[PDB]
Coordinates of C-alpha atoms and ligand atoms in Angstrom, one line a residue:
Chain H
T61 CA 77.9 50.1 143.7
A62 CA 80.0 49.2 140.7
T63 CA 78.3 49.2 137.3
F64 CA 78.5 47.6 133.9
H65 CA 78.1 49.2 130.5
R66 CA 78.2 48.1 127.0
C67 CA 77.5 49.7 123.6
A68 CA 73.8 50.4 122.8
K69 CA 74.6 49.9 119.1
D70 CA 74.8 46.2 119.0
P71 CA 76.8 45.5 115.9
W72 CA 79.5 47.7 117.4
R73 CA 80.0 45.7 120.5
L74 CA 83.1 43.5 121.0
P75 CA 82.3 40.9 123.7
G76 CA 85.1 39.1 125.5
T77 CA 87.2 42.2 126.1
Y78 CA 86.5 44.5 128.9
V79 CA 87.7 47.8 130.3
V80 CA 87.9 47.6 134.1
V81 CA 87.9 51.2 135.5
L82 CA 89.0 51.7 139.1
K83 CA 88.2 54.5 141.5
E84 CA 90.0 57.8 140.8
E85 CA 92.8 57.7 143.4
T86 CA 93.7 54.1 142.9
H87 CA 97.5 53.7 142.5
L88 CA 99.2 51.8 139.7
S89 CA 100.5 49.1 142.2
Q90 CA 96.9 48.5 143.2
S91 CA 95.6 48.3 139.7
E92 CA 98.1 45.6 139.0
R93 CA 97.2 43.7 142.1
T94 CA 93.5 43.9 141.3
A95 CA 94.1 42.5 137.8
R96 CA 96.1 39.5 139.3
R97 CA 93.4 39.0 141.9
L98 CA 90.9 38.8 139.1
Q99 CA 93.0 36.3 137.1
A100 CA 93.5 34.1 140.1
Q101 CA 89.8 34.1 141.1
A102 CA 89.0 33.3 137.4
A103 CA 91.6 30.5 137.2
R104 CA 90.0 28.8 140.3
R105 CA 86.8 28.7 138.4
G106 CA 88.4 27.2 135.4
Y107 CA 88.6 30.4 133.3
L108 CA 91.5 31.7 131.3
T109 CA 92.1 35.4 131.3
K110 CA 94.6 37.7 129.7
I111 CA 95.6 41.1 131.0
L112 CA 96.2 43.1 127.9
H113 CA 97.1 46.5 129.4
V114 CA 97.2 48.3 132.8
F115 CA 96.0 51.8 132.6
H116 CA 97.6 54.7 134.4
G117 CA 98.0 58.4 133.7
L118 CA 94.5 59.2 132.8
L119 CA 92.2 56.5 134.3
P120 CA 93.3 53.8 136.6
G121 CA 92.3 50.3 135.6
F122 CA 93.1 47.6 133.1
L123 CA 92.1 45.9 129.9
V124 CA 91.1 42.2 130.1
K125 CA 90.2 39.4 127.7
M126 CA 87.8 37.0 129.5
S127 CA 84.3 35.4 129.3
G128 CA 81.5 37.7 130.3
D129 CA 80.6 34.9 132.8
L130 CA 83.1 36.6 135.1
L131 CA 81.5 40.0 135.3
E132 CA 79.6 39.5 138.6
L133 CA 83.0 38.4 140.1
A134 CA 84.9 41.4 138.6
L135 CA 82.3 44.0 139.8
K136 CA 83.0 42.8 143.3
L137 CA 86.7 43.3 143.3
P138 CA 88.1 46.0 145.5
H139 CA 88.4 49.6 144.1
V140 CA 86.2 48.9 141.0
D141 CA 84.2 52.0 139.8
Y142 CA 82.7 50.4 136.6
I143 CA 83.3 48.0 133.8
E144 CA 82.7 48.7 130.1
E145 CA 82.7 46.1 127.3
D146 CA 85.0 47.1 124.5
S147 CA 83.5 48.3 121.2
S148 CA 84.3 49.6 117.8
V149 CA 85.2 53.1 116.5
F150 CA 85.4 54.0 112.8
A151 CA 87.2 56.6 110.7
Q152 CA 84.8 59.6 110.1
Chain M
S1 CA 93.0 78.2 92.5
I2 CA 92.4 78.6 96.3
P3 CA 90.3 75.6 97.5
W4 CA 86.8 76.6 98.4
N5 CA 87.3 75.6 102.0
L6 CA 90.4 77.6 102.7
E7 CA 88.6 80.7 101.3
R8 CA 85.6 79.9 103.5
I9 CA 87.5 79.9 106.8
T10 CA 89.2 83.2 105.8
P11 CA 87.6 86.1 107.7
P12 CA 86.2 89.3 106.0
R13 CA 89.3 91.3 107.0
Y14 CA 92.6 89.4 107.2
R15 CA 96.5 89.5 106.8
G24 CA 101.3 79.0 111.3
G25 CA 101.1 76.8 114.4
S26 CA 104.8 75.9 115.0
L27 CA 105.1 76.4 118.8
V28 CA 102.0 74.1 119.0
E29 CA 102.0 70.4 118.3
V30 CA 99.0 68.5 116.8
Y31 CA 98.5 64.8 117.6
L32 CA 96.5 62.8 115.1
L33 CA 94.8 59.5 116.0
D34 CA 94.0 57.7 112.8
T35 CA 95.1 55.2 110.2
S36 CA 98.7 55.0 109.3
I37 CA 100.0 57.9 107.3
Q38 CA 102.3 58.3 104.2
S39 CA 104.8 60.6 106.0
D40 CA 106.9 61.1 102.8
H41 CA 104.1 62.8 100.9
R42 CA 105.4 66.2 99.8
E43 CA 102.5 68.0 101.4
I44 CA 103.5 66.9 104.9
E45 CA 107.0 65.4 104.7
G46 CA 109.2 66.9 107.4
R47 CA 106.2 68.3 109.3
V48 CA 104.8 65.0 110.6
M49 CA 106.4 62.6 113.0
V50 CA 105.0 59.0 112.9
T51 CA 105.2 57.7 116.4
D52 CA 104.7 54.1 115.3
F53 CA 102.4 53.7 118.2
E54 CA 100.0 51.2 117.0
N55 CA 96.9 49.6 118.5
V56 CA 94.4 48.3 116.0
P57 CA 92.1 45.3 115.6
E58 CA 92.7 42.6 112.9
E59 CA 91.1 42.9 109.5
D60 CA 87.7 41.2 108.9
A68 CA 98.7 49.7 101.3
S69 CA 97.7 52.8 99.3
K70 CA 94.2 52.3 100.8
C71 CA 95.7 51.7 104.4
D72 CA 97.1 55.2 104.8
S73 CA 94.6 57.0 102.7
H74 CA 92.3 58.5 105.4
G75 CA 95.1 59.7 107.7
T76 CA 97.3 61.3 105.0
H77 CA 94.5 63.3 103.8
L78 CA 93.7 64.7 107.2
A79 CA 97.4 65.3 108.0
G80 CA 97.4 67.4 104.8
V81 CA 94.3 69.3 105.8
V82 CA 95.8 70.2 109.1
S83 CA 99.3 71.1 108.0
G84 CA 99.8 70.5 104.3
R85 CA 102.1 73.1 102.6
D86 CA 99.9 73.8 99.6
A87 CA 96.4 72.9 100.8
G88 CA 96.6 72.9 104.6
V89 CA 95.0 75.2 107.1
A90 CA 98.0 75.6 109.5
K91 CA 100.7 75.3 106.9
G92 CA 103.6 75.5 109.4
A93 CA 102.5 73.1 112.2
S94 CA 104.3 70.1 113.7
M95 CA 102.4 66.9 113.8
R96 CA 102.7 63.5 115.5
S97 CA 100.5 60.5 114.4
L98 CA 99.4 57.4 116.4
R99 CA 97.9 54.5 114.6
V100 CA 94.5 53.5 116.1
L101 CA 92.6 52.6 113.0
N102 CA 93.4 49.5 110.9
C103 CA 93.6 49.3 107.1
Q104 CA 89.8 49.1 106.8
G105 CA 89.4 52.2 109.0
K106 CA 88.4 50.3 112.2
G107 CA 89.6 50.8 115.8
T108 CA 88.5 50.0 119.4
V109 CA 87.6 52.0 122.5
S110 CA 90.3 50.3 124.3
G111 CA 92.8 51.0 121.6
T112 CA 91.8 54.7 121.5
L113 CA 92.3 54.9 125.3
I114 CA 95.7 53.4 125.0
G115 CA 96.5 56.1 122.4
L116 CA 95.2 58.9 124.6
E117 CA 97.1 57.5 127.4
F118 CA 100.3 57.4 125.2
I119 CA 100.0 61.1 124.5
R120 CA 99.7 62.1 128.1
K121 CA 102.8 59.9 129.0
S122 CA 104.8 61.5 126.2
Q123 CA 104.0 64.9 127.4
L124 CA 105.0 64.1 130.9
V125 CA 108.3 62.7 129.8
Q126 CA 109.3 65.5 127.3
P127 CA 107.1 68.6 127.9
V128 CA 106.6 70.9 124.9
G129 CA 104.0 73.6 124.4
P130 CA 100.2 73.5 123.9
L131 CA 98.8 70.3 122.4
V132 CA 95.9 69.8 120.0
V133 CA 94.5 66.3 119.6
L134 CA 92.5 65.4 116.6
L135 CA 90.1 62.6 117.0
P136 CA 88.7 62.0 113.5
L137 CA 86.6 59.0 114.6
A138 CA 83.5 57.9 116.3
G139 CA 81.6 55.0 118.0
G140 CA 78.6 54.9 120.1
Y141 CA 78.3 56.6 123.5
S142 CA 81.1 55.3 125.7
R143 CA 81.4 56.1 129.4
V144 CA 85.0 55.3 129.5
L145 CA 86.1 57.1 126.4
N146 CA 84.2 60.3 127.4
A147 CA 86.0 60.1 130.7
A148 CA 89.4 59.7 129.3
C149 CA 88.8 62.7 127.1
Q150 CA 87.6 64.8 129.9
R151 CA 90.6 63.9 132.1
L152 CA 93.0 64.7 129.2
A153 CA 91.2 68.0 128.7
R154 CA 91.6 68.9 132.4
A155 CA 95.3 68.2 132.2
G156 CA 95.3 71.1 129.7
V157 CA 95.3 69.5 126.3
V158 CA 92.9 70.7 123.6
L159 CA 90.8 68.0 121.9
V160 CA 89.0 68.4 118.6
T161 CA 86.7 65.7 117.4
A162 CA 84.3 64.7 114.6
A163 CA 80.6 65.0 115.3
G164 CA 80.0 61.8 113.3
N165 CA 78.5 61.0 109.9
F166 CA 75.1 59.5 110.7
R167 CA 72.7 62.4 110.3
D168 CA 71.9 61.9 114.0
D169 CA 72.2 63.6 117.4
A170 CA 75.9 63.8 118.1
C171 CA 75.4 63.2 121.9
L172 CA 74.8 59.5 121.1
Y173 CA 78.4 59.0 119.9
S174 CA 81.8 59.3 121.5
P175 CA 84.1 61.1 121.6
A176 CA 81.6 63.5 120.0
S177 CA 79.5 63.6 123.2
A178 CA 82.5 63.9 125.5
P179 CA 82.5 66.7 127.9
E180 CA 85.3 69.4 127.5
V181 CA 85.9 68.8 123.8
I182 CA 85.5 70.8 120.7
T183 CA 83.1 68.7 118.5
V184 CA 82.8 69.6 114.8
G185 CA 80.0 69.0 112.2
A186 CA 80.5 69.4 108.4
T187 CA 79.2 71.9 105.9
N188 CA 79.4 72.1 102.2
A189 CA 80.3 74.8 99.7
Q190 CA 76.7 76.3 100.1
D191 CA 77.3 76.4 103.8
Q192 CA 74.6 73.7 104.3
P193 CA 74.9 70.7 106.5
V194 CA 76.2 67.8 104.6
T195 CA 73.5 65.3 103.9
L196 CA 74.0 62.3 101.5
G197 CA 71.1 59.9 101.5
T198 CA 70.8 58.3 105.0
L199 CA 74.3 59.6 106.0
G200 CA 75.6 63.1 106.7
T201 CA 76.8 65.5 109.4
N202 CA 75.6 64.8 113.0
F203 CA 74.0 67.7 114.8
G204 CA 72.4 68.8 118.1
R205 CA 73.8 70.4 121.2
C206 CA 77.0 68.4 121.5
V207 CA 78.1 69.9 118.2
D208 CA 80.1 73.0 119.0
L209 CA 80.4 74.4 115.5
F210 CA 80.6 73.4 111.8
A211 CA 83.4 73.7 109.3
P212 CA 84.0 72.8 105.7
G213 CA 83.6 69.0 105.3
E214 CA 82.6 68.2 101.7
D215 CA 84.9 68.1 98.7
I216 CA 88.0 69.0 100.7
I217 CA 91.2 68.7 98.7
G218 CA 94.3 67.3 100.4
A219 CA 97.2 64.9 100.2
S220 CA 96.6 61.5 98.5
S221 CA 98.6 58.5 99.4
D222 CA 98.3 57.2 95.9
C223 CA 101.6 58.9 95.0
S224 CA 104.0 61.3 96.9
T225 CA 102.6 64.4 95.0
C226 CA 99.0 63.5 94.3
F227 CA 95.7 65.1 95.7
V228 CA 92.1 63.9 96.3
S229 CA 88.8 65.4 97.5
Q230 CA 87.4 63.6 100.5
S231 CA 84.3 64.5 102.6
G232 CA 83.4 64.0 106.3
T233 CA 83.1 65.3 109.8
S234 CA 86.8 64.3 110.1
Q235 CA 87.7 66.8 107.4
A236 CA 85.6 69.3 109.3
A237 CA 87.3 68.7 112.6
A238 CA 90.8 68.9 110.8
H239 CA 90.0 72.5 109.8
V240 CA 89.3 73.3 113.4
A241 CA 92.5 71.6 114.7
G242 CA 94.4 73.8 112.2
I243 CA 92.5 76.9 113.3
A244 CA 93.2 76.0 116.9
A245 CA 97.0 75.5 116.2
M246 CA 97.1 79.0 114.8
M247 CA 95.1 80.4 117.7
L248 CA 97.3 78.8 120.3
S249 CA 100.5 80.1 118.5
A250 CA 99.3 83.7 118.7
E251 CA 98.0 83.3 122.3
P252 CA 99.7 80.3 123.9
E253 CA 98.2 80.9 127.3
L254 CA 94.6 80.2 126.2
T255 CA 92.6 77.9 128.3
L256 CA 90.2 75.5 126.5
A257 CA 87.3 77.8 127.5
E258 CA 89.0 80.9 126.1
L259 CA 89.8 79.0 123.0
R260 CA 86.1 77.7 122.5
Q261 CA 84.8 81.2 123.1
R262 CA 87.2 82.5 120.3
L263 CA 86.2 79.9 117.8
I264 CA 82.5 80.8 118.3
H265 CA 83.0 84.6 118.2
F266 CA 85.1 84.5 115.1
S267 CA 82.6 82.1 113.3
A268 CA 80.2 83.0 110.5
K269 CA 76.8 83.2 112.1
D270 CA 73.2 82.3 110.9
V271 CA 74.6 81.0 107.6
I272 CA 73.2 77.5 107.9
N273 CA 69.6 76.9 106.7
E274 CA 68.3 75.0 109.7
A275 CA 65.6 73.4 107.6
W276 CA 68.0 70.5 106.8
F277 CA 67.9 69.4 110.5
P278 CA 65.0 67.7 112.4
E279 CA 62.6 70.1 114.0
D280 CA 63.6 69.4 117.5
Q281 CA 67.3 69.7 116.9
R282 CA 67.3 73.1 115.1
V283 CA 67.1 75.2 118.3
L284 CA 69.8 72.9 119.9
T285 CA 72.2 73.0 117.0
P286 CA 74.7 75.9 116.7
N287 CA 74.6 78.0 113.5
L288 CA 78.3 78.7 113.2
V289 CA 80.8 78.0 110.5
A290 CA 84.4 78.1 111.7
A291 CA 86.8 80.8 110.5
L292 CA 90.3 82.2 111.2
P293 CA 90.6 85.3 113.3
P294 CA 91.0 88.6 111.5
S295 CA 94.0 91.1 111.5
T296 CA 91.8 93.5 113.5
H297 CA 92.6 91.4 116.6
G300 CA 92.3 95.1 123.7
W301 CA 89.8 93.3 125.9
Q302 CA 86.3 92.1 124.9
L303 CA 83.3 90.4 126.5
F304 CA 82.8 86.9 125.1
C305 CA 79.7 84.9 125.9
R306 CA 78.3 81.6 124.8
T307 CA 75.0 79.8 125.1
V308 CA 75.2 76.3 126.8
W309 CA 72.2 73.9 126.6
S310 CA 71.8 71.2 129.2
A311 CA 70.8 67.6 128.6
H312 CA 67.0 67.3 128.6
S313 CA 65.8 66.8 132.2
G314 CA 63.6 63.8 131.4
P315 CA 59.9 63.4 132.4
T316 CA 60.2 62.8 136.2
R317 CA 58.0 65.1 138.3
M318 CA 60.9 66.4 140.3
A319 CA 63.3 66.5 137.2
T320 CA 66.0 69.0 136.9
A321 CA 68.2 69.9 134.0
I322 CA 71.5 71.6 134.8
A323 CA 73.6 73.8 132.5
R324 CA 77.2 74.5 133.8
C325 CA 80.0 76.7 132.6
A326 CA 83.7 75.9 132.4
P327 CA 85.7 76.6 135.6
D328 CA 87.1 80.0 134.3
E329 CA 83.7 81.4 133.1
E330 CA 80.9 83.2 134.9
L331 CA 77.2 82.3 134.5
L332 CA 75.6 85.7 133.6
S333 CA 72.1 84.5 133.0
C334 CA 69.9 81.4 133.0
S335 CA 66.7 80.6 131.0
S336 CA 64.8 77.4 130.1
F337 CA 62.7 75.9 127.4
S338 CA 60.2 73.0 127.0
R339 CA 58.5 72.2 123.8
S340 CA 55.2 71.7 125.5
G341 CA 55.4 74.7 127.7
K342 CA 55.0 72.5 130.7
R343 CA 57.6 74.1 132.9
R344 CA 58.4 75.4 136.3
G345 CA 61.1 77.8 135.0
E346 CA 64.7 78.1 136.2
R347 CA 67.0 79.4 138.9
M348 CA 70.7 80.2 139.4
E349 CA 72.0 78.2 142.3
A350 CA 75.6 77.9 143.8
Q351 CA 77.5 74.6 143.8
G352 CA 81.1 74.0 144.7
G353 CA 81.3 77.8 145.1
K354 CA 80.2 78.4 141.5
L355 CA 76.9 79.3 140.0
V356 CA 75.0 76.9 137.7
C357 CA 71.7 77.2 135.7
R358 CA 69.0 74.8 136.9
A359 CA 65.6 74.3 135.2
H360 CA 62.5 72.6 136.6
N361 CA 60.1 70.3 135.0
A362 CA 56.3 70.6 135.6
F363 CA 54.0 67.7 136.7
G364 CA 53.2 65.9 133.4
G365 CA 56.0 67.6 131.4
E366 CA 58.1 65.5 129.0
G367 CA 61.1 67.4 130.4
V368 CA 62.9 70.7 130.0
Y369 CA 66.2 72.3 129.0
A370 CA 68.2 74.6 131.2
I371 CA 70.1 77.1 129.0
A372 CA 73.2 78.9 130.4
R373 CA 74.8 82.0 129.2
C374 CA 78.5 81.6 130.1
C375 CA 80.9 84.5 129.7
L376 CA 84.7 85.2 130.1
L377 CA 84.6 88.1 132.6
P378 CA 87.7 88.6 134.7
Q379 CA 87.4 90.9 137.8
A380 CA 83.8 90.0 138.1
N381 CA 82.3 89.5 141.5
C382 CA 78.8 88.1 140.7
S383 CA 76.1 87.2 143.0
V384 CA 72.4 86.3 143.0
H385 CA 69.6 88.2 144.5
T386 CA 66.4 86.3 145.0
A387 CA 62.8 87.3 146.0
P388 CA 59.9 84.9 146.8
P389 CA 56.4 85.2 145.4
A390 CA 54.8 88.7 146.1
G395 CA 54.0 91.3 140.6
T396 CA 57.4 89.9 142.1
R397 CA 60.5 92.2 141.9
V398 CA 64.2 92.4 142.9
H399 CA 67.2 94.7 142.0
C400 CA 71.1 95.1 142.4
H401 CA 71.6 97.6 145.2
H405 CA 76.7 96.6 140.4
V406 CA 75.1 95.8 137.0
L407 CA 72.2 93.4 136.3
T408 CA 73.2 90.8 133.8
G409 CA 70.4 88.3 134.0
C410 CA 66.8 87.5 135.2
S411 CA 65.5 84.0 136.0
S412 CA 62.3 82.9 137.4
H413 CA 60.7 79.7 139.0
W414 CA 57.3 78.8 140.5
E415 CA 56.1 75.8 142.5
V416 CA 52.5 75.9 141.4
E417 CA 50.9 73.8 138.6
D418 CA 49.6 76.9 136.7
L419 CA 49.3 80.7 136.4
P433 CA 66.6 99.9 135.9
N434 CA 68.7 97.0 137.3
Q435 CA 65.3 95.4 138.2
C436 CA 63.8 92.0 137.4
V437 CA 60.0 91.5 137.5
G438 CA 58.3 88.2 137.7
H439 CA 54.9 86.7 138.0
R440 CA 53.1 87.4 141.2
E441 CA 53.2 83.7 142.1
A442 CA 56.9 83.2 141.1
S443 CA 60.3 83.6 142.7
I444 CA 62.6 85.9 140.8
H445 CA 66.4 85.8 140.6
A446 CA 68.8 88.5 139.4
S447 CA 72.4 87.9 138.4
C448 CA 74.3 91.0 139.6
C449 CA 78.0 91.6 138.9
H450 CA 80.6 93.9 140.1
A451 CA 82.5 94.6 136.9
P452 CA 84.0 98.0 136.5
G453 CA 84.5 99.0 132.9
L454 CA 81.3 97.2 132.0
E455 CA 78.3 99.0 130.7
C456 CA 74.9 97.3 130.3
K457 CA 71.6 98.3 128.7
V458 CA 68.2 96.6 128.5
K459 CA 66.3 96.4 125.2
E460 CA 62.6 95.4 125.0
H461 CA 60.4 94.3 122.1
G462 CA 56.8 93.0 122.1
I463 CA 54.1 92.0 119.5
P464 CA 50.6 90.5 119.2
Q467 CA 52.8 85.0 117.8
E468 CA 55.2 82.0 117.5
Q469 CA 58.5 83.8 118.2
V470 CA 59.5 87.3 119.2
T471 CA 63.0 88.5 118.8
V472 CA 65.4 91.2 119.9
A473 CA 69.1 91.7 119.2
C474 CA 71.9 93.7 120.8
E475 CA 73.5 96.4 118.8
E476 CA 76.6 95.4 116.9
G477 CA 79.6 95.5 119.3
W478 CA 77.5 94.6 122.3
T479 CA 77.3 91.1 123.9
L480 CA 74.0 89.5 124.8
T481 CA 74.3 88.5 128.5
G482 CA 70.7 87.7 129.4
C483 CA 67.5 86.8 127.6
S484 CA 64.1 86.3 129.2
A485 CA 60.4 86.9 128.5
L486 CA 58.2 89.5 130.2
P487 CA 55.4 87.8 132.1
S490 CA 50.8 85.0 127.1
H491 CA 51.9 81.4 127.7
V492 CA 55.6 81.1 127.0
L493 CA 57.5 77.9 126.0
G494 CA 60.8 79.4 126.8
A495 CA 63.5 81.8 125.9
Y496 CA 67.1 81.5 124.7
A497 CA 70.1 83.5 123.4
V498 CA 71.0 82.7 119.8
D499 CA 74.4 84.5 119.3
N500 CA 73.5 88.1 120.3
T501 CA 69.8 87.7 119.6
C502 CA 67.3 86.9 122.3
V503 CA 64.5 84.6 121.2
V504 CA 61.2 84.1 123.0
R505 CA 58.9 81.2 122.0
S506 CA 55.2 81.1 122.8
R507 CA 52.0 79.2 122.1
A519 CA 51.1 90.5 124.0
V520 CA 54.4 88.6 124.4
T521 CA 57.6 90.6 125.2
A522 CA 61.3 89.7 124.7
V523 CA 63.8 91.3 127.0
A524 CA 67.5 91.4 126.2
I525 CA 70.3 92.5 128.5
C526 CA 73.4 93.7 126.5
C527 CA 76.9 94.6 127.9
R528 CA 80.2 95.9 126.7
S529 CA 83.4 97.5 128.0
Chain Y
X1 CA 78.1 53.4 104.4
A2 CA 78.8 50.9 107.2
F3 CA 79.5 53.0 109.1
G4 CA 79.8 56.6 107.7
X5 CA 83.4 55.9 106.6
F6 CA 85.5 57.1 103.6
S7 CA 83.6 60.1 102.3
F8 CA 80.0 59.1 103.5
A9 CA 80.8 55.6 102.1
Ligands
CA1 CA1 80.9 69.3 123.6

């Protein structure tokens, strides 16, 4: 039931970095585990990943640098609510 | 000598922010500028993308000065903290902005202070995650003020502008008109909460420690509101976000924007309010606001929902479609709280549900419904609102509907509350009826020849048609 | 402006 989203304004997209948002009650220990599980499943497929940040305090989840090839895999991880591709913001 | 903008936000009768802290998410800032030195703490939090020094801290310094600058600021006292989420070219990321928002919440948990106002002078396209983080940060009790965006476009298409539970600010110029500059200019539409001065706004320049520059933008506009909010929270620290939003609206200049500048369909959706500081004149008052839903879309069973904040009561509910292809609206309960729901007709492009949400403590409000009979129902308590829906394809504390329609009355137990009903009819594109000065419009509906819809605009009830009669319900202590 | 930055570009 987990879904993917990326910016409709195409120039503002930033592929290769993704925000993985986990379900609301997920605990920090679980977020960390889910990121490692991801890196491991990716490595078995020959893909490098980098976990840039683990989110807690507002949303649980993590920020990851990886090929988009891995999105089908990531959406199937336990606890995942949705995944959003990073994108640009600009001073107004 | 007073800058046009600081005069504009000054109310017609008048006489800060130090208990309050304002966070700024922006470029780096020149913290030693004499406008702001000693008032701003640079956190040295930084999360910015790589490029692809005077100029680097230009944007941020100006806004820090607008908020708190000693000569040209709105909230001349206030304490500030800055996070760097925009690079030297003024570019950031959604991920970086989240990390910043997250940093603010963590700081707060570790060393709690008073009320927080967060200025987000930045925009990207619609972001599910960014809107969510903002919402969550708002529910934790933090006030967020953001720029509508500078694209002369519907602000709902951008984040954080579109983010639920946030004060979103568009920009007006010295003539109180929406800023438009070629293909760029203020955003507009229903996600904009209000406008504020945002053209030719003088403030601190990072060129030199005592220099000044005029800059323009919805960031500048939002900065005025953060300042106004810092002052409002200093005087009344216990304000909830909803109470604060109702105050910004109530104390705004009304019907001062010429709505011709905006696209035809966005005029009705766009609030005609220019922010201002509260007067010296202020005892309890009835505050209400008009809340437009997202458009329902064209599905045959489509519904649009307009909701109030948790601490507000829905006192009335109307709807509008541009075509007039409409099955009306109803007030229905949901998580023990009433919402405004509107129904699309078969073949309609969609409809808006339009709530009237009010701050009314001690209210016990309920709904009284009657099925098709004309159709009538009363509070057997004061009537604050009539709604009506039908299931067919075509056609004294009392509501009256069409003989084929269901009719719904919003009835409240509110002692100390007086209401009256004012009617007006004519032969007609628009009919109009206003509450008397000092009264608050609680409900607006059309007497049942083919109506497009009805909506409250401030304390004026507007009925739109293709012998039509506008009906306003007005209350006060 | 690209995109709406620094005073309407
Ligand atoms: Ca909003």
